[PDB]
Design an enzyme around this catalytic site. Structure first.
Site, PDB file in Angstrom:
ATOM      1  N   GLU A  27      -8.179  -3.807   8.393  1.00 54.04           N
ATOM      2  CA  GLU A  27      -7.810  -3.204   7.491  1.00 54.04           C
ATOM      3  C   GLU A  27      -6.627  -3.547   5.739  1.00 54.04           C
ATOM      4  OE1 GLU A  27      -7.168   1.421   8.553  1.00 54.04           O
ATOM      5  OE2 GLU A  27      -5.786   0.295   7.596  1.00 54.04           O
ATOM      6  N   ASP A  30      -0.809  -4.748   5.001  1.00 56.63           N
ATOM      7  CA  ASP A  30      -0.539  -4.803   6.202  1.00 56.63           C
ATOM      8  C   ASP A  30      -1.602  -5.764   6.602  1.00 56.63           C
ATOM      9  OD1 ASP A  30       1.004  -3.148   6.757  1.00 56.63           O
ATOM     10  OD2 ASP A  30      -0.041  -1.346   7.056  1.00 56.63           O
ATOM     11  N   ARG A  87       1.039  -2.222  14.741  1.00 58.92           N
ATOM     12  CA  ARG A  87      -0.956  -2.357  15.958  1.00 58.92           C
ATOM     13  C   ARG A  87      -0.487  -3.867  15.818  1.00 58.92           C
ATOM     14  NH1 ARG A  87      -4.235   0.332  10.360  1.00 58.92           N
ATOM     15  NH2 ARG A  87      -4.476   2.059  11.363  1.00 58.92           N
ATOM     16  N   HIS A 143       0.572 -12.990  16.657  1.00 54.72           N
ATOM     17  CA  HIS A 143       1.332 -12.093  15.989  1.00 54.72           C
ATOM     18  C   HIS A 143       2.033 -11.274  17.298  1.00 54.72           C
ATOM     19  CE1 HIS A 143      -2.681  -9.748  14.680  1.00 54.72           C
ATOM     20  NE2 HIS A 143      -2.805 -11.384  13.727  1.00 54.72           N
ATOM     21  N   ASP A 162      -3.174  -6.424   9.591  1.00 60.16           N
ATOM     22  CA  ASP A 162      -4.096  -6.182  10.539  1.00 60.16           C
ATOM     23  C   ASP A 162      -5.737  -6.055   9.517  1.00 60.16           C
ATOM     24  OD1 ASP A 162      -4.208  -4.231   8.833  1.00 60.16           O
ATOM     25  OD2 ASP A 162      -4.304  -2.669  10.380  1.00 60.16           O
ATOM     26  N   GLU A 171       0.638  -0.966  -0.258  1.00 58.08           N
ATOM     27  CA  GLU A 171       0.392   0.109  -0.096  1.00 58.08           C
ATOM     28  C   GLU A 171       0.708   0.913   0.070  1.00 58.08           C
ATOM     29  OE1 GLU A 171       0.165  -2.554   2.082  1.00 58.08           O
ATOM     30  OE2 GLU A 171      -1.191  -1.933   3.937  1.00 58.08           O
ATOM     31  N   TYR A 223       5.629  -4.507  13.239  1.00 57.48           N
ATOM     32  CA  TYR A 223       4.081  -4.289  12.603  1.00 57.48           C
ATOM     33  C   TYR A 223       4.073  -3.351  13.877  1.00 57.48           C
ATOM     34  CZ  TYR A 223      -0.288  -3.251  11.667  1.00 57.48           C
ATOM     35  OH  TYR A 223      -1.215  -2.787  10.639  1.00 57.48           O
TER      36      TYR A 223
HETATM   37  C1  LIG Z   1      -7.802  -2.698  10.715  1.00 50.01           C
HETATM   38  C2  LIG Z   1      -8.004  -3.458  12.363  1.00 50.01           C
HETATM   39  C3  LIG Z   1      -7.565  -4.272  12.959  1.00 50.01           C
HETATM   40  N1  LIG Z   1      -7.672  -5.182  14.374  1.00 50.01           N
HETATM   41  C4  LIG Z   1      -7.307  -5.975  14.327  1.00 50.01           C
HETATM   42  C5  LIG Z   1      -7.363  -6.757  15.472  1.00 50.01           C
HETATM   43  C6  LIG Z   1      -6.398  -8.532  15.484  1.00 50.01           C
HETATM   44  O1  LIG Z   1      -5.398  -7.576  16.532  1.00 50.01           O
HETATM   45  C7  LIG Z   1      -5.835  -8.279  14.085  1.00 50.01           C
HETATM   46  C8  LIG Z   1      -7.058  -8.424  13.468  1.00 50.01           C
HETATM   47  O2  LIG Z   1      -6.769 -10.526  13.460  1.00 50.01           O
HETATM   48  P1  LIG Z   1      -7.685 -11.664  13.445  1.00 50.01           P
HETATM   49  O3  LIG Z   1      -8.783 -11.762  12.931  1.00 50.01           O
HETATM   50  O4  LIG Z   1      -7.112 -13.010  13.961  1.00 50.01           O
HETATM   51  O5  LIG Z   1      -8.652 -11.795  15.224  1.00 50.01           O
HETATM   52  O6  LIG Z   1      -6.150  -6.750  13.858  1.00 50.01           O
HETATM   53  C9  LIG Z   1      -9.359  -4.164  14.794  1.00 50.01           C
HETATM   54  O7  LIG Z   1      -9.668  -4.754  16.005  1.00 50.01           O
HETATM   55  N2  LIG Z   1      -9.428  -3.687  13.667  1.00 50.01           N
HETATM   56  C10 LIG Z   1      -9.199  -2.615  12.574  1.00 50.01           C
HETATM   57  O8  LIG Z   1      -9.321  -1.983  12.061  1.00 50.01           O
END
Ligand SMILES: Cc1cn([C@H]2C[C@H](O)[C@@H](COP(=O)(O)O)O2)c(=O)[nH]c1=O
Ligand SMILES: Cc1cn([C@H]2C[C@H](OP(=O)(O)O)[C@@H](COP(=O)(O)O)O2)c(=O)[nH]c1=O
Ligand SMILES: Cc1cn([C@H]2C[C@H](O)[C@@H](COP(=O)(O)O)O2)c(=O)[nH]c1=O
Length: 557
Positions: free
Chosen positions: A89, A85, A295, A333, A87, A8, A293
């Site tokens: 998003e 990335d 986040r 993660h 996550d 991205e 990462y």
């Molecule tokens: C981009 C984004 C990620 N996340 C997260 C939470 C978790 O760390 C991960 C999703 O991974 P998971 O599908 O394995 O639960 O990204 C949100 O809760 N909201 C968002 O907007």
């Protein structure tokens, strides 16, 4: 017939291109490519709560160019890799690229990596994965309900309170926290309490400082001038002696490596960095392949990461700093840590001073977390003086342990029964102080604590509530504006569920269940929308029917 790799941003493209052979063709989409914008309401939102959440995504401005540029790159590639990335998003963005480019779903792979290094990229492309529709659904669900609250609550706010005002699913709850904190502070009544320190001399003339703790075996807490003076005259005549000495070996362990929330707090406390600043620099560092990462809320460390740093500690600090076994802090993660522990802040290529300081901060917390505990000899002298009991605490560092990686930074000798000579008594007036004002990073901490935010939304929440006459940061601290309270009360009264902390935390859970195939996104959105319209419907009614109160102050007539 080479492979196409899509990321991205240009910065991430350059970094990942260093680890991908000529068989790969890296190309950044530089943006989201596609996204959302009474049918009028539906068009503005780009989502339809009444037609099973049918969405309407359109390519962003000037992106039709990027789109037509990616398609032809795809027709020349035997496989398309979406390296967005890790996550949700990112998953959603990967989905948008796969949708816009089109072609056979089999032509697409979803590579996952939490750092852009040689090995991390190799492991990611050696075992390429599939796009996870649930994480995409989880992300869109979040997005859809944010749009619904914002586009359906705001209008009510314009009609009832003032035009231009905004409403945010999570933003309104974040604000609520600030507003409650503001009100706590406003209503707080400082209370006066006294303390009394005693300067004394050990048998061999050494100076010893003590603070009275007990009188009549009850906590010493005089509340005024008279009670303190009365205690002082009793204390001036008492015979002092060491009732007991207690030498205990204590330790201080290093904290866990950083996660999003803790990184923000430490960057804010130790570097004076605001959340936006910390996250912007964190991204910079991550995209340049310098740290994992940014986040995450997982404190795990990969075995290579742990063995690497242990090698660093062993060579640069020594056996005494290397714990027997690796420290384990408690997903899949990782924590925010540098990608290569041997890369120093001062050696980062194109990072501004502050970005280097953030890395340094991350590096030190990381290295320290894998170092042995600091050892101190703690001493606690309890002194008796008539019906009083005095205390003296002190400790001397025996082994610095983990504190060795942090910047460079005394009870006298006395036996049980030794007589102390009073030199002076110092009574001091204090006052209980009101609860601290949230800071950007401190509010996130509270958000996380309540299971309200999320690694990738914390920063957005902080910023999103800042430029809307609701709350403001003054001297790095949050202050609740009048409009903030006015709106917060209205929302608490007519949108209780939406404003409730548990329910908001529960929605984050509901979104996690979607991401994990334990719930269907549309049914989850249906349920959210159901509770929502029910709240909204009564909110729109006249106040005389339980509807939202207009922000008016009617005269005598
Ligand atoms: C981009 C984004 C990620 N996340 C997260 C939470 C978790 O760390 C991960 C999703 O991974 P998971 O599908 O394995 O639960 O990204 C949100 O809760 N909201 C968002 O907007
Ligand atoms: C990351 C970091 C930690 N530390 C020390 C200070 C804190 O110890 P003292 O409380 O004993 O002062 C501790 C905070 O860790 P965190 O920043 O993880 O909270 O680590 C530094 O001195 N500088 C740094 O840059
Ligand atoms: C007021 C003020 C706060 N801060 C901080 C430290 C924390 O990161 C944050 C507030 O958190 P705290 O409430 O836990 O102290 O803001 C400074 O660094 N300097 C200041 O002058």
């Amino acid at each position: 017939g080479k492979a196409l790799v899509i990321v991205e941003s240009p910065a991430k493209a350059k970094t990942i291109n260093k680890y991908l052979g000529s068989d790969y063709v890296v190309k950044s989409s530089v943006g989201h490519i596609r996204d959302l914008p009474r049918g009028a309401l539906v068009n503005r939102m780009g989502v339809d709560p009444w037609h099973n959440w049918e969405a309407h995504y359109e390519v962003l401005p000037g992106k039709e160019k990027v789109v037509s540029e990616l398609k032809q790159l795809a027709e020349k590639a035997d496989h398309i890799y979406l390296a967005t990335d890790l996550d949700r998003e990112g998953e959603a963005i990967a989905w948008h690229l796969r949708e816009v480019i089109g072609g056979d779903d089999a032509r697409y792979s979803r590579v996952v990596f939490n750092e852009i290094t040689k090995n991390a990229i190799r492991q990611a492309f050696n075992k390429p994965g599939e796009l996870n529709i649930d994480r995409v659904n989880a992300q869109q669900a979040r997005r859809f309900m944010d749009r619904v609250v914002g586009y359906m609550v705001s209008p009510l706010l314009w009609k009832k309170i003032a035009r231009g005002l905004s409403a945010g699913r999570v933003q309104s709850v974040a604000v609520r926290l600030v507003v409650e904190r503001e009100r706590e502070i406003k209503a707080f009544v400082p209370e006066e309490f006294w303390e009394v320190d005693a300067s004394t001399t050990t048998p061999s003339g050494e100076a010893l400082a003590l603070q009275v703790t007990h009188q009549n075996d009850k906590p010493f807490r005089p509340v005024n001038k008279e009670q303190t003076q009365a205690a002082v005259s009793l204390l001036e005549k008492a015979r002092y002696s060491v009732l007991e000495r207690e030498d205990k070996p204590t330790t201080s362990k290093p904290g866990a490596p950083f996660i999003t929330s803790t990184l923000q707090q430490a960057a804010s406390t130790r570097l004076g960095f605001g959340v936006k600043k910390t996250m912007m620099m964190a991204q910079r560092l991550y995209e340049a392949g310098y740290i994992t990462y940014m986040r995450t809320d997982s404190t795990n460390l990969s075995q290579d990461a742990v063995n690497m740093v242990r090698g660093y500690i062993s060579d640069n600090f020594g056996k005494k700093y290397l714990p027997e076994s690796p420290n384990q802090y408690a997903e899949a993660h990782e924590a925010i840590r540098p990608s290569d522990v041997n890369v120093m802040a001062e050696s980062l290529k194109d990072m501004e001073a502050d970005a280097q300081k953030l890395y340094q901060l991350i590096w030190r917390q990381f290295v320290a977390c894998q170092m042995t505990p600091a050892k101190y000899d703690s001493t606690t002298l309890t002194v008796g003086a008539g019906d009083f009991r005095l205390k003296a605490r002190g400790r001397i560092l025996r082994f610095d342990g983990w504190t060795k990686v942090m910047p460079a930074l005394i009870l006298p000798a006395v036996n049980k029964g030794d007589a102390l000579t009073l030199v002076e008594l110092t009574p001091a007036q204090h006052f209980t102080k009101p609860p601290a004002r949230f800071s950007e990073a401190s509010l996130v901490k509270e958000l996380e604590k309540r299971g309200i935010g999320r690694p990738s939304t914390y920063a957005s929440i902080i910023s999103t509530i800042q430029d809307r006459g609701y709350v403001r940061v003054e001297n790095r601290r949050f202050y609740a504006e009048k409009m903030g309270e006015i709106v917060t009360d209205r929302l608490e009264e007519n949108f209780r569920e939406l404003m409730n902390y548990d329910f908001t935390a529960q929605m984050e859970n509901s979104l996690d269940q979607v991401a994990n195939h334990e719930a269907e996104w549309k049914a989850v959105l249906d349920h959210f929308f159901s509770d929502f319209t029910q709240q909204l419907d009564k909110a729109e009614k006249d106040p005389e029917e339980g509807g939202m109160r207009p922000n008016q102050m009617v005269l005598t007539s």
